[PDB]
């Protein structure tokens, strides 16, 4: 009472395949034939920040732009600035092996974790003036990919369990438990509204999940390899991912089909670093050839190159207004884009 | 006016600049191993050396994707424990070497047990007979030979893999333990001195 | 999405020299690097060979050397094990296994857990 079960599920996994096929009647490369394209743009490194030791993983934007938040491996994590080059804070990390980090939209409270099944937690707003430690987290049974926040009270953090989680501050664990994913988790991003957010795995697959409702609604299985970075875009109605086998798929939300496909014969490095820009135009995603891509939404075509790194891209930064992107690396070098 | 920017900031920036400076000397002066194989931090001093140890097994056996983070440490210590199986061993070994994130990274041997603790090897390889000893050091006691041919086997074997795609990028140090079950600690500290040379005159281009 | 199907196993007497092949679907063949994994009864999973993609890099376990035999074709986009010398304990599931490693061989396939690009496996008997 097995075989039938799985041949009613690929029966109707077929069905629904002949179903997108017959829905998709039209792709979306005769629809932007008549845009002019937006040549080639040129980018070059305002400042050069320094003052890291070890690689850094993921980075965290500010919320007015001013002030971003880093992570490395030497248990340091230091809060850079954008209009300036000296630093504000330097916040010792009790975890050696930090792998993310986590910016509030109110700007008062940080996150950090990975490699240790801790989730900590730490606040910059204090009278002494000196930060503290506001909790630890100890119910996970893996390694923490990236941390976000919802709000000012609530944080989402994927491990390596398997299994997504929803912290809150004064309830101590997790309200709800979303399980059914087959693969590890390694990257998530929130939409504008704040709403609905996508879960990139190891088996090539995407699922929409419900912070209110807790099922998912959602499954993309149009991928080939593991997903590595993940973003939305700025309307929020699609997203973009880049799998380790070179090429990026717009997903969308609404249309359960790919989109569009930005496979490139020339090179075959992975992708490791996904995000938007502020009208969306752009596509910023990073590459394992020491050096960042940017491809057009409309005609998927590379119009820049943000070449210069020492070391492989690991994170990638952009604004919320698009003011300025940010690039990360294994090395301890940061550079700002415009 | 706003001059308090380039009134507390310019000092505020180089207060915990100092410290870094102290963070840094710290943090260069330790060594940082991984102990891969068969409670969670090591923290010891042999001859006025820093060691940090890192050892994991709270998560599960799958070091497909967190492994890429250890690529600052200067050597990952193997642990066998064969005492099939070796057939995992030999992947994961085969797998660390390949690796593109590891190809700049030593791998230490311990081609014994773990749990300092004091026989079937023609049906799991099809050539035991036809093998030749090295000309190696001879066993201090002296008595029955035959069991050493299957760990000399395996030695070889492992340095055959290590060579294959070894050159000069990493090295690999086999060694077995359990003999004395006292001195576990200097041959690593050895190794380590080993391969902080051989860096430093690959960055001179003497070797 | 990827898909990995075989057939071809059933209890078939021993010295029948019968064919075993798995299908690839969902994904380009020549890309991908293909192993055979197996797991015994009672036993956790083993891996039997693998062929790279240019298809020189072969190798074989201790106990399927010489007797196993792979041949890889970029029409049919399917994989071919060739098993001899059939014996009551070399029972097993076969799963035609996927390293998902663009030209890089650094992936694993011998875990006992699940894998994401792992068939479902057939049982094969004496």
């Known amino acids: 009472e097995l075989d039938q079960l799985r041949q009613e599920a690929e029966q109707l996994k077929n069905q629904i395949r002949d179903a997108r096929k017959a829905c998709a009647d039209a792709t979306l490369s005769q629809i932007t034939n008549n845009i002019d394209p937006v040549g080639r743009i040129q980018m070059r490194t305002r400042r050069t920040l320094r003052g890291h030791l070890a690689k850094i993983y993921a980075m965290h934007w500010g919320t007015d732009s001013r002030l971003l938040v880093s992570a490395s491996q030497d248990g340091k994590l230091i809060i850079w600035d954008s209009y300036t080059t000296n630093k504000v804070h330097a916040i010792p990390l009790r975890s050696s092996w930090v792998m993310t980090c986590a910016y509030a939209p109110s700007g008062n409270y940080v996150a950090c974790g990975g490699l240790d099944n801790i989730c900590s937690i730490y606040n910059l707003k204090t009278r002494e003036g000196n930060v503290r430690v506001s909790r630890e987290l100890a119910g996970h049974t893996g390694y923490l990919s990236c941390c976000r926040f919802l709000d000012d009270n609530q944080i989402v953090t994927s491990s390596g369990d398997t299994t997504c989680a929803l912290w809150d501050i004064e309830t101590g664990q997790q309200t709800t438990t979303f399980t059914g994913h087959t693969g590890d988790v390694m990257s998530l991003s929130l939409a504008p509204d704040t709403r609905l957010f996508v879960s990139g795995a190891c088996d090539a697959s995407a699922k929409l999940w419900d912070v209110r409702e807790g099922m998912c609604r959602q499954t993309f299985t149009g991928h080939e390899s593991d997903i590595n970075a993940i973003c939305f875009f700025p309307n929020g109605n699609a997203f973009a991912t880049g799998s380790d086998d070179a090429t990026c798929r717009l997903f969308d939300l609404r249309a359960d089909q790919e989109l569009m496909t930005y496979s490139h014969d020339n090179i075959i490095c992975g992708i490791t670093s996904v995000s938007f820009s502020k009208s969306g135009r752009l596509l910023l995603a990073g590459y394992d050839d020491f050096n960042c891509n940017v491809w057009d939404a409309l005609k998927a075509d590379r119009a820049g190159v943000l070449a210069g790194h020492d070391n492989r891209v690991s994170c990638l930064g952009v604004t919320d207004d698009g003011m300025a992107v940010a690039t990360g690396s294994w090395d301890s070098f940061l550079k700002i884009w415009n | 006016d706003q001059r308090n920017e380039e009134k507390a900031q310019r000092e505020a920036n180089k207060k915990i600049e100092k410290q870094l400076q102290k963070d840094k000397q710290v943090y260069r002066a330790t060594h940082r191993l991984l102990l891969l194989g068969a409670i969670f931090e090591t923290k010891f001093q042999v001859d006025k050396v820093n060691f940090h140890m890192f050892d994991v097994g709270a998560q599960r056996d799958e070091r497909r994707k967190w492994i890429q983070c250890f690529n600052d440490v200067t050597a990952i210590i193997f642990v066998v424990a064969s005492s099939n199986r070796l057939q995992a061993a030999l992947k994961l070994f085969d797998s660390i070497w390949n690796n593109k994130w590891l190809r700049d990274t030593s791998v230490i041997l311990f081609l014994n047990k773990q749990d300092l603790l004091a026989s079937k090897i023609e049906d799991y390889f099809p050539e035991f007979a036809r093998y030749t000893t090295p000309e190696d050091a001879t066993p201090e006691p002296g008595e029955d030979p035959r069991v050493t041919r299957a760990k000399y086997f395996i030695r070889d074997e492992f340095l055959r893999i290590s060579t294959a795609s070894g050159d000069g990028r990493h090295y690999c140090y086999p060694h077995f333990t359990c003999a004395v079950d006292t001195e576990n600690i200097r041959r690593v500290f050895n190794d380590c001195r080993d391969i902080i040379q051989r860096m430093h005159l690959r960055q001179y281009e003497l070797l | 999405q990827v898909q990995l199907q075989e057939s071809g196993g059933g209890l078939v007497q021993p010295g029948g020299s019968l064919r075993l092949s798995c299908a690839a679907s969902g994904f380009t063949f020549s890309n991908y690097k293909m192993n055979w994994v197996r797991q015994a009864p009672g036993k956790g999973l083993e891996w039997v060979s693998d062929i790279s993609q240019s298809g020189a890099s072969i190798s074989y376990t201790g106990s399927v050397k010489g007797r196993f035999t792979i041949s890889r074709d970029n029409a049919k986009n399917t994989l071919y094990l060739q098993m001899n010398s059939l014996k009551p304990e070399d029972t097993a599931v076969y799963y035609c296994?996927?390293?998902?490693?663009?030209?890089?061989?650094?992936?694993?396939?011998?875990?006992?857990?699940?894998?994401?690009?792992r068939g479902q496996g057939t049982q094969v008997t004496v």
């Open positions: 296994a996927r390293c998902p490693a663009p030209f890089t061989r650094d992936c694993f396939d011998v875990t006992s857990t699940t894998y994401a690009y």
